[PDB]
From a paper:
Interestingly, the cryo-EM reconstruction also reveals that the spike bound to [name] displays an unusual conformation where two RBDs are in the “up” ACE2-binding conformation. In the pool of particles that enabled a high-resolution reconstruction, approximately half of the particles had one RBD “up” (1-up) and the other half a conformation with two RBDs “up” (2-up). To the best of our knowledge, the latter conformation has rarely been observed for the [name]-[name]-2 prefusion spike but is commonly observed for the MERS and [name]-1 spikes. In both main conformations and for both “up” and “down” spike protomers, [name] binds in the inner edge of the ACE2 interaction interface of the RBD thereby effectively hindering ACE2 binding. Interestingly, ACE2 binding to the “up” protomer is hindered in the “1-up” conformation also from [name] binding the neighboring “down” protomer. This interprotomer-mediated blockage is true also for the corresponding “up” protomer in the “2-up” conformation but not for the 2nd “up” protomer in this conformation. Hence, even if the blockage of ACE2 binding in the “1-up” conformation from two independent sites may contribute significantly to the efficacy in neutralization by [name], the interprotomer-medicated blockage is reduced in the “2-up” conformation. The “2-up” conformation of the spike naturally confers extra avidity with its two binding sites for ACE2. We can at this stage only speculate if the binding of [name] itself induces a conformational change that results in the “2-up” conformation or if [name] promotes a conformational stabilization of the “2-up” in the spike’s dynamical landscape. Clearly, this conformation makes epitopes accessible for the development of therapeutic binders in the central cavity of the spike, this includes the lower portion of the RBD and possibly also the central helical region.
Host cell entry is orchestrated by the viral spike protein that, upon binding to ACE2, mediates fusion of the viral membrane with the host membrane. The ectodomain of the heavily glycosylated spike protein forms a trimer where each protomer consists of a core S2 subunit and a distal S1 subunit. Each S1 subunit comprises a receptor-binding domain (RBD) that can switch between an exposed “up” conformation and a “down” conformation, where the latter is inaccessible for ACE2 binding. In particular, sybody 23 ([name]) binds to recombinant RBD as well as to the prefusion [name] with high affinity and shows very potent neutralization activity.
Residue numbers in the entry:
A (entry chain B): 14 to 70, 76 to 247, 252 to 298
B (entry chain A): 299 to 458, 460 to 476, 478 to 518, 521 to 620, 641 to 674, 691 to 694
C (entry chain C): 447 to 458, 460 to 476, 478 to 496
Write the structure that this text describes.
């Protein structure tokens, strides 16, 4: 059972400038100290990406509708790992197979499966006051499933779940693509020391996983977590976090590979005349 | 060189006729470890099976399926179908596998087949005309047959046609034409029937456990075993690494591959180093020795002596004189210096025995 | 049903314009040693 959450002020969507980010390895080929030009779905340099906030200060709980055109670059700026998971599908109402990724307090769950997805699915962590322990308590995503094809559960682990105070210190970058029936998820982690921005510099997004699913994906949504310690839809706190969403387009990129074999720098072939 | 020049007289000089190349031997294939084995063990040999009209559905994907072990066991009585063969099936990959398991009688094995009609084939289970996959049946006298009578197996016997791959859990009473209003009596008999297998029953009525495996194609998830071979170095070898086929000799590589990178390509987009999946070892591939062959003669009018020059070939493995231009055989190297007569190259000349 | 026409069904390649009049049993895998049974089947089938 799920209940829609109230007390969310309406504010126009925010767009932020992405500076030379969203670059990933085009293939699984090792190259050392060479310039390679490749055409693939990439995020343009110095582009505009949609920025969603989460802060108590309203509470700025951002779980709106987001389309899936050709691939998604998802950056998460966090200090307590508020973001939890992702949902992909077309109809989102149990009449078409969907994909779900959730990183709960102990494991990582990837389900290619049909769900009766709620309009406002979320996670909820209860912060006890008698004793200091942050543990996940609520999971309002799906109702039931009759058919189901792909299940994957990672090994159990432990997580902090505590909400630290200060500036953001973690940046999780992901790239999701779906081509030739294959769903590619690329991930990277980066420490940061900023309060609100998209970090500059260069970072190569190494591959993580390649699922052979072969389903149509033209609609995706995100899943956050809320802290608790009011009513069922009023007594909730989002927590300080932010995430940027960008769309990938077919572009030609020129990449320099150093002696280590990792990606050192990349330039576009359509940004400005110097890069071309 | 006479054949190359299309003449029976050869003038003094050097001519490139053929091209020596080391043939590749001990072709090897390497594939990742076979460590993804979904539980096929108890899907075919379990404690108990459901009835034929309540057949269970098993979904198989993302598995490494090997069917050679099933075929060579020789403990299964029934193995016959069209469209596929007992051999070469391990090299065919399919997207999904559907398994239907139940228990039938001895005479029921004939009815379960595509294109075959019958009471069971019309009221219990039927197969499509374009059916992919087939059925395996094995004797279960020691398990299904029980002394005194076994009545746990039930099959539909009265029905009003069934769609292919259709499951009908409902067993509503059948009307033969005064309605019985769902009450047992005239014109309304029991639509189902038990088997009552007995140990005294012969081969015609003995129980048989049946599993039907069907494959559907239209990305592939479950493939064959993909067997591998041994790894050998220091020889010109045909190597098959993760489906990539090539020719060359392996050697120790100092390159440090990233964990997500399998093979490496240098400038001009050709394979340079490859990491084998079994032991995460990076090996440098280099082409085995090859090069042109030059025939040095002082002229047929002068003499029939011949020198053979392998160009840029370290011919230690095949009057041998090695220079940076290759290796020359058949001419005696001398420490003197004369005017060049037959230019071999790299400051080395030959003249007329043949001296270099 | 007319069963006077036969065609090969199981065999181990065949060169162009090659005649194979022998119908020796075909082994697809414990060998049966020329005896009808498991792991081997008759290579000839009738059109009917
Ligand atoms: C959250 O809000 C949505 C829409 O405001 C609710 O969806 C409605 O669900 C009912 C019954 O499930 C349908 O009859 C309506 O047609 C739906 N609305 C629309 C616009 O399609 C949803 O039920 C709410 N969640 C709750 C109350 O928990
Ligand atoms: C996080 O999700 C995993 C995956 O569902 C949970 O692991 C399952 O937990 C249920 C309930 O205890 C068990 O019945 C399953 O057998 C578990 N699946 C496994 C271990 O693969 C896990 O409990 C979740 N963690 C929290 C804190 O809710
Ligand atoms: C922001 O994004 C929009 C597209 O939504 C784009 O047209 C615009 O150029 C971007 N930059 C600015 C400064 O608006
Ligand atoms: C201690 O914290 C845990 C959360 O991990 C909570 O379940 C438990 O109720 C707390 N103890 C008491 C006495 O409330
Ligand atoms: C599940 O798969 C079956 C098989 O085709 C299909 O008929 C059915 O509509 C699917 N969904 C549900 C909820 O059963
Ligand atoms: C995806 O859409 C195409 C549209 O042509 C359709 O043919 C295909 O069946 C769809 N696949 C799924 C899994 O819905
Ligand atoms: C690879 O990276 C290391 C630092 O981790 C550096 O010392 C080395 O020079 C690089 N290049 C190599 C090993 O060829
Ligand atoms: C039962 O079938 C499985 C198939 O995976 C096989 O491995 C096993 O040896 C069989 N056991 C018997 C007793 O036939
Ligand atoms: C593959 O299996 C062999 C044999 O057990 C083992 O030595 C090797 O470490 C394995 N490699 C991987 C990547 O699992
Ligand atoms: C070489 O040719 C000349 C004339 O063309 C001839 O007199 C001589 O006999 C030839 N040499 C030999 C070894 O036959
Ligand atoms: C290759 O040629 C060099 C000549 O400098 C020789 O010393 C070496 O032994 C040759 N390689 C082999 C494998 O014989
Ligand atoms: C090698 O060359 C030196 C100097 O020209 C000469 O004295 C010597 O006799 C030569 N040795 C041979 C075996 O040709």
């Amino acid at each position: 059972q799920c209940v829609n959450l109230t007390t969310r002020t309406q504010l126009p969507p925010a767009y932020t400038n992405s500076f030379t980010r969203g670059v990933y390895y085009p293939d699984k080929v090792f190259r050392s100290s060479v310039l390679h030009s490749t055409q693939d779905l990439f995020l343009p340099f110095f582009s505009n990406v949609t920025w969603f906030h989460a802060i108590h200060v309203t509470k700025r709980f951002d779980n709106p509708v987001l389309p899936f055109n050709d691939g998604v670059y998802f950056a998460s700026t966090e200090k307590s790992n508020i973001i939890r998971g992702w949902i992909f599908g077309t109809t989102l109402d149990s009449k078409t197979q969907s994909l779900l990724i959730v990183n709960n307090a102990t494991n990582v769950v990837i389900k290619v499966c049909e769900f009766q997805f709620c309009n406002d699915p979320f996670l909820g962590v209860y912060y006890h006051k008698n004793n200091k322990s942050w543990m996940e308590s609520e999971f309002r995503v799906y109702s039931s499933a009759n058919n189901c094809t792909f299940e994957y559960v990672s090994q159990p682990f432990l997580m902090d779940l505590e909400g630290k105070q200060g500036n953001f210190k973690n940046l999780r970058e992901f790239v999701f693509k779906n081509i030739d029936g294959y769903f590619k998820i690329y991930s990277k982690h980066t420490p940061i020391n900023l309060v609100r921005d998209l970090p500059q510099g260069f970072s190569a997004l190494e591959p993580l996983v390649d699922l052979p699913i072969g389903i149509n994906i033209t609609r995706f949504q995100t899943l956050l977590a809320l802290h608790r310690s009011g009513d069922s839809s009023s007594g909730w706190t989002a927590g300080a976090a932010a995430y940027y969403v960008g769309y990938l387009q077919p572009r030609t990129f020129l990449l320099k590979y150093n002696e280590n074999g990792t990606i050192t720098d990349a330039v576009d072939c359509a940004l400005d005349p110097l890069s071309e | 060189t006479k054949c190359t020049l299309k003449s029976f007289t050869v003038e003094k000089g050097i001519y490139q006729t053929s091209n020596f190349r080391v043939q590749p031997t001990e072709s090897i294939v390497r594939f990742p470890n076979i460590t993804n084995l979904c539980p096929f063990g108890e899907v075919f040999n379990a404690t108990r099976f459901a009835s034929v009209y309540a057949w269970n559905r098993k979904r198989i994907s993302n598995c490494v399926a090997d069917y050679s072990v099933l075929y060579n066991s020789a403990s299964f009585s029934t193995f016959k179908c069209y469209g596929v063969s007992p051999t070469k099936l391990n090299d065919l990959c399919f997207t999904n596998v559907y398994a239907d398991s139940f228990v039938i009688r001895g005479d029921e094995v004939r009815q379960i087949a595509p294109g075959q009609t019958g009471k069971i084939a019309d009221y219990n289970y039927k197969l499509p005309d374009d059916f992919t996959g087939c059925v395996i049946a094995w004797n279960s006298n020691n398990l299904d047959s029980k002394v005194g009578g076994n009545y746990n197996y039930l099959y539909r016997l009265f029905r009003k046609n069934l769609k292919p791959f259709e499951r009908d859990i409902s067993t509503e009473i059948y009307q033969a034409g005064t309605p019985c209003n769902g009450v047992e009596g005239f014109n309304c008999y029991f639509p189902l029937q038990s088997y009552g297998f007995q140990p005294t029953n012969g081969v015609g009525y003995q129980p048989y456990r049946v599993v039907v495996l069907s494959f559907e194609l239209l990305p592939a998830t479950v493939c064959g075993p993909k067997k591998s071979t041994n790894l050998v170095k220091n020889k010109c070898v045909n190597f098959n690494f993760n489906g990539l086929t090539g020719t060359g000799v392996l050697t120790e590589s100092n390159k440090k591959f990233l964990p997500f990178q399998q093979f490496g390509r240098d400038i001009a987009d050709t394979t340079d180093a490859v990491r084998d999946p079994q032991t995460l070892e990076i090996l440098d591939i280099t082409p085995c020795s090859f090069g042109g062959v030059s025939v040095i003669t002082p002229g047929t009018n002068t003499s029939n002596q011949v020198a053979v020059l392998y160009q840029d070939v370290n011919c230690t493995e095949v009057n041998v004189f090695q220079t940076r231009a290759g290796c020359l055989i058949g001419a005696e190297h001398v420490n003197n210096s004369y005017e060049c007569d037959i230019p071999i190259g790299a400051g080395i000349c030959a003249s007329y025995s043949i001296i270099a």
